[PDB]
């Protein structure tokens, strides 16, 4: 019955974010001195189930100015890899015991920039032709700021696999030796997944009611994934063999708080005005990243504290 483990992970994670656009607004609501969905719920909880019906009733008119083989091709991969990246992830048991998987998350997330280059290009002119380029051009700059400081904690945790990562953080909450890295982890991951401070993000305006919902459903799929990926890495939880249930109780509830942070930072800040936006990476972020890359090499050597593998 391996197949029923599959359908009881893909389907119960769609409702995890289909019932989040509700939570998106209510958290936005109770900052502005206003209430949530009032007339339909009653507590709101009957709102998105009706709105999900509308986007498949309303007519998806196609552009006559574009091809068709390319235009639906980008929503094919949009649910493809952005859901595939869930697979070797433990809670506390992953679906696949990959011998190396931290490279595997970056290997799949590097194809996220390979989808936006489709929809703007094969569609139309200007906005969809030049405006969709720059968004790749910012999101190519946030793998080098991502992968290097990623590598600086594998030097101390020990290896590539994720199953040993739980045991090595059973006493630590490893933000404490890497609270400089904690900023440049969370800032960079915020910037890649196309959210409110780091936004410039025509690659949506042409999509009618049919395939706009996908590239609204896949984009949300990313954002709880960078929450659940930071969750196992920085804020590791306790593990009990005889009680596996107690793991997952205090597992998702910690990722759910960091899920609110994307909703919470959005309610504070303006944009960054694109010329500054890359200028604050190379000139400002990247020299500190190399310095702390040199830092986590010498110190486990000058401790005789090399992690075993």
């Amino acid at each position: 019955m391996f197949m029923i483990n599959i359908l009881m992970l893909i389907i119960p994670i769609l409702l995890a974010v289909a019932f989040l656009t509700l939570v998106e607004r209510k958290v936005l609501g109770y900052m502005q001195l206003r209430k949530g969905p009032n007339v339909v719920g009653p507590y709101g909880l009957l709102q998105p189930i009706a709105d999900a019906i509308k986007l498949f009733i309303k007519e998806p008119l196609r552009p006559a100015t574009s091809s068709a083989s390319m235009f639906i091709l980008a929503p094919i991969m949009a649910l493809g890899l952005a859901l595939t990246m869930w697979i070797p992830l433990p809670m506390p048991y992953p679906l696949i015991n990959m011998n190396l998987g931290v490279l595997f998350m970056l290997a799949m997330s590097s194809l996220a920039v390979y989808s936006i280059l489709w929809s703007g290009w094969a569609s139309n002119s200007k906005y969809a032709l030049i405006g969709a380029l720059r968004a790749v051009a910012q999101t190519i700059s946030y793998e080098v700021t991502l992968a290097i400081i990623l590598l600086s904690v594998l030097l101390m945790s020990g290896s590539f696999t994720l199953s040993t990562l739980i045991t090595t953080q059973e006493q630590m909450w490893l933000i404490l030796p890497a609270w400089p890295l904690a900023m440049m982890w969370f800032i960079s991951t915020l910037a890649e997944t196309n959210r409110a401070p780091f936004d410039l993000t025509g690659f949506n305006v042409e999509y009618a009611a049919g395939p706009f919902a996908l590239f609204f459903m896949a984009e949300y799929a990313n954002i709880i994934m960078m929450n659940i990926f930071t969750a196992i890495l920085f804020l590791g939880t306790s593990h009990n063999p005889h009680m596996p249930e107690l793991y997952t109780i205090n597992f998702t509830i910690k990722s759910l708080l960091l899920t609110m942070s994307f909703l919470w930072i959005r309610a504070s800040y303006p944009r960054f005005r694109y010329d500054q936006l890359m200028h604050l990476l190379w000139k400002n972020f990247l020299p500190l990243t190399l310095a702390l890359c040199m830092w986590h090499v010498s110190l486990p050597i000058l401790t005789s504290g090399i992690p075993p593998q």
Partner: peptide, 16 residues
């Protein structure tokens, strides 16, 4: 002016 820029919350914090 702070809405073109794109800030949400000082629009609702003052019209109320």
């Amino acid at each position: 002016h702070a809405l073109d820029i794109g800030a949400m919350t000082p629009f609702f914090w003052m019209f109320e």
